[PDB]
Amino acid sequence: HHHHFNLPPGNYKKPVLLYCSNGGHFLRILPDGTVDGTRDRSDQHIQLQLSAESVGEVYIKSTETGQYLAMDTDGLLYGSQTPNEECLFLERLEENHYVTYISKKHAEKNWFVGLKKNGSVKRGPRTHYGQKAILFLPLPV
Questions:
Q1: Taking Cα atoms as reference points, which of 101, 27, 97 lies closest to residue 59?
Q2: What does UniProt give as the signal peptide span?
Q3: Residue 26 neighbours by CB distance under 10 Å
Q4: How many C-beta atoms surround the C-beta of residue 137 within 10 A?
Q5: Is 118 labelled a binding residue?
Q6: Which of 42, 61, 90, 137 is placed for a possible disulfide with 102 were both Cys, Cβ 3.0 to 4.6 Å?
Q7: Going from the N-terminus, what domains does the chain have, and what CATH number goes with each?
Q8: 109 by DSSP, 3-state: which?
Q9: How far apart are CA 86 and CA 79, in angstroms?
Q10: Distance between CA atoms of 51 and 125, rounded to whole angstroms?
Q11: CB contact burial 62-81 (16+ within 10 A = b; e otherwise)
Q12: Nearest-angstrom CA–CA distance, 32 and 97
């Protein structure tokens, strides 16, 4: 395929917080489908549950609202009420430590889930290997 296959510790038993090392925000999916980041560890919308569709492919869903993280045709993240092709991400280890999530639908273009230092999500085309915005550390709740 288009990417390596170094995988991070596999465990989707319980929910996690996706902490972004670039700014230290937790990924958040709001009820209205908006996706962004917040530093508030107590936010009810940052608790996420990952599940593996195929080895190395995951869905990322809000435990509070049931929404699936998804990246659209123009690279914007949104919360989807139902699982679709835009909701699958390739979960990969990076720098032998961090976890990156690559849009499966747009894998050939290297579009990643990423957060800026100001807490706003990055648009797919603006992401790329080597950025700090793409580096996550899932924290078990």
A1: 101
A2: none
A3: 23
A4: 15
A5: no
A6: 90
A7: 1-141 (2.80.10.50)
A8: helix
A9: 10
A10: 25
A11: bbbbebbbbbeeebebbbbe
A12: 33
